[PDB]
Design a protein around this ligand. Structure first.
Ligand SMILES: NC(=O)c1ccc[n+]([C@@H]2O[C@H](COP(=O)([O-])OP(=O)(O)OC[C@H]3O[C@@H](n4cnc5c(N)ncnc54)[C@H](OP(=O)(O)O)[C@@H]3O)[C@@H](O)[C@H]2O)c1
Ligand SMILES: CCc1nc(N)nc(N)c1OCC1CN(c2ccccc2N2CCC(C(=O)O)CC2)C1
Length: 166
């Protein structure tokens, strides 16, 4: 349903090579270069996230500055300030390039509607654990390109993949 709307809908996430995106209510690695990449791609745009991701943000970073923060929840509203709440992904997207920034539940809702995915792969050894949030799997409707492996100042290797709907 990526052509049920006019504005581009992009998913953006970072994952380990094993496909983990979240653990224990947070992200189980630190990668400053990915944060800068995420900031450059999203600055000045609407960012849409699930409520658990909203609550996972450290207070210094909530709301994400310089972006319209939209939080998808079934609740009437939120205790933590700075978001616009909506009750569905469709309400998040219209009116409106909108970035869906996680987590796994909101990626699953948005994947059928998305035109683009921007993935950072982090070469950190994290065998998936029972409660982990995992990255969405991309099917045959996506075409991708991949950048070279880069080395972070902290020593972790990482790289970016970019997918567009065929
Ligand atoms: N690595 C990355 O790039 C990345 C990015 C973002 C997040 N994360 C990680 O992902 C994890 C959180 O992901 P998650 O999947 O547990 O949660 P999530 O997708 O962030 O949020 C789930 C919440 O969204 C709301 N929601 C879900 N489906 C809905 C629907 N159909 N209609 C309305 N509201 C709906 C509900 O909020 P209510 O309960 O309020 O109703 C639900 O509890 C954390 O570990 C976080 O650190 C990682
Ligand atoms: C940087 C992590 C990330 N990476 C890619 N590639 N995709 C994503 N969806 C993604 O999750 C973005 C959300 C979760 N985040 C976060 C989590 C923990 C500590 C700091 C942050 N934030 C605060 C605001 C900063 C900003 O000003 O942008 C960015 C870092 C914002």
């Amino acid at each position: 349903h990526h052509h049920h709307h006019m504005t581009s809908v992009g998913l953006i996430w970072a994952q380990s090579t094993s496909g983990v995106i979240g653990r224990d209510g947070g992200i189980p690695w630190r990668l400053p270069e990915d944060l800068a990449h995420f900031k450059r791609l999203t600055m000045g745009h609407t960012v849409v996230m699930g409520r658990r991701t909203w609550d996972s943000l450290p207070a210094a970073h909530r709301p994400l500055p310089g972006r319209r923060n939209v939080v998808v929840t079934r609740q009437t509203g939120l205790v933590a300030h700075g978001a616009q709440v909506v009750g569905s992904l469709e309400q998040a997207l219209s009116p409106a390039a909108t970035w869906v920034i996680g987590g796994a539940q909101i990626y699953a809702l948005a994947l059928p509607l998305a035109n683009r995915c921007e993935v950072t792969e982090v070469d950190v050894d994290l065998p998936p654990e029972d409660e982990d949030a995992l990255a969405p799997v991309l099917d045959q409707t996506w075409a991708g390109t991949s950048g070279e492996w880069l080395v972070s100042r902290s020593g972790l290797r990482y790289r970016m993949h970019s997918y567009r709907r065929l």
